[PDB]
């Protein structure tokens, strides 16, 4: 009923359905689901015990599952562990030009070069390392090629081994920069002093013999409030947001500012919104007198530095010849073929370029069309591959900074002046 | 980890990783990043010491970096200095016709001719100077050619040297004029006297036996306020602003005036906006009497001279033959080829025509596709090139003046007249 991950299966040679601690016999359906793996994990004429009086036979028997019994039995953890790839803390790159950010990314040995090199090594790529070292991911030269980057083992000096000198190459390209609204941060908030926006004056004249309250001067209508933004390092020209979001509330003044999706961050450097504030003055004027009235509207400015984080995605191409001894390609070629494969480090786009999709669906033999990650787990272990892929898929975020300003706080002043006799 | 600028590296011949004051040994990764420069800065079979027990070998060894040790060692400042091109104070040209502004720009020897001449000289152009002087950028003739300008060393009289008479030419063209809203300035502000815009009168008649307050006369609706602008010298026909901006607040009266981007400044010489002011009169009329009521609306005019600054950008083409001894083109040709290259003095447009981009990315050998600025630094020094490029890239701003007027201040008057008996 539940999915079965082949890496957790193990054969106990103890007797009829014995298994070990926290290990239970495997049933017929789970067997059939992972028959390819299980039969590849046993001898040609070997016969092993399943649950419910069933047995699975070796490749010589064509992997038949038949009712029977045997002295050994395949077993599965009663408390299986999830093999999901851990998500690590994001790697933060300081804001800068696009090329500078890429340069800082690809020259980080611990976080980029070594993880990708070890991934290529695990997948079966040959000569992932330079001649001046015997360890994977060492003595690697980084070069700028076109709009992308190439990391390749140094080939200077001599080398020993078959086709040594055909070093594996790791190519980075197709950089894209999203934007995370939730990553917003701001510096010191500066609020300017009240500034007089406009003023309207008037006179209320009463030449009658009784006081009059029948006056009304009203100032209303939409008042446009403008907001402005600046960009610092020029990477913003490539930054986009997949979903429209509102500018975050800073202080206690909400600005109805919308950032459009699928548009350059550097193109949206200003705008205006509407606020409706109305004021009115209705004086009571004594007989034979005039009263002056005034309505004033003031604005104020709020400004602060801003910093967002742009998620960085790219395309990682591994190019080189797969090792004869063992590689992770599902056909397991043994002719040392030249091979190129592109992964998309970032959001899912397709199954072939998605490490996470292939890793998660490794319990479905029919979905294994590119890489056999179960083979990698068997060769190197579950934890090792988990950590390596977590480092490879570690989120990378580039700073996006600037300055922001907006006319937000609005104030009013309504004045009824002293009466003046009409004799004037 | 951090970028390494080759101009700051220096070889100490002292012993095993000695270096000098505030100078540390260079590691393997930084070496590999700037290997081309470092290996070009050493002898064919020379061997120099890196950090962590590594050594870098000369061109004869093909620039190999291998674990080892040597009696000398490359070293890098522990407190590196930024080689960024300084930004100087803007050069202000008085407002005038386009041709006059260009004429004043290109005839400024100290600010335009000599800097560009020295830039061409540093890049390796030959004969940047006239025959009547032995110094660069002297005895240079300026001529109007089509819609652009040409500065070339005077070729009158005799000359000594190979291909003397093939003087280098500096061509200016492609002038563009932006506009900086923040550069706004205004002269003396003139406010006119209140002028009666409109008047509505009425009668409130009460033929009953009790006082009546049930009257209301209301004057409201949008009131169009017009603004006008004049242009003085005719350069405004070419002036445009990349971003829409609001007319600055002058005095304490905000005018909702928007200047459209990508449109001629001289085409936007007026407009109108809407302000909503409403007045009402609700008299209390005594029995058997009539009262006259009046509502008046007045406007006023605010006018002042205005001055903005238009940032001037242009295309600077250097044409001439590169010196055999040494030039800054990345291929370092030695056949004295005729060569033409255009820089864009102003906003970035492309890598090839951007001095700032090439200068900043000089630590990436793969981005060095046009000019080798590290070669210029080695030949002439960092400070010299910094100052020369700052003068070349010095911002230039042309005046844009005129007169501005707008109907801004609005006033009202509400009058309730004296009662008149109905016997009349």
Residue numbers in the entry:
A (entry chain A), B (entry chain G): 1 to 424
Question: What text does the study give?
Answer:
Aerolysin is a β-pore-forming toxin produced by most Aeromonas bacteria, which has attracted large attention in the field of nanopore sensing due to its narrow and charged pore lumen. Pore-forming toxins (PFTs) are important virulence factors of many pathogenic bacteria, which are secreted in a soluble form and upon host membrane binding, they oligomerize into transmembrane pores undergoing a complex structural reorganization. Domains 3 and 4 form the 120 Å long 14-stranded β-barrel, with each protomer contributing two antiparallel β-strands. Four distinct constriction rings, two at each end of the pore, were identified from the structures and confirmed by MD simulation.
Here, we present the first high-resolution cryo-EM maps and atomic models of WT aerolysin in a membrane-like environment and its Y221G prepore-like mutant. Upon prepore assembly, domains 1 and 2 of adjacent protomers interact through a series of salt bridges and H-bonds that greatly stabilize the cap region. Furthermore, the formation of the concentric β-barrel fold contributes to the stabilization of the prepore through the addition of over 10 H-bonds per subunit. Interestingly, five H-bonds consolidate the lumen of the concentric β-barrel being present both in the prepore and pore configuration. The prepore stability is further enhanced by the hydrophobic residues at the interface of the two β-barrels. Pore formation retains the tight network of bonds between protomers observed in the prepore, while introducing several additional interactions at the folded hinge regions. Overall, previously unseen interactions between side chain and backbone atoms can be observed in both prepore and pore conformations of aerolysin structures at high resolution.
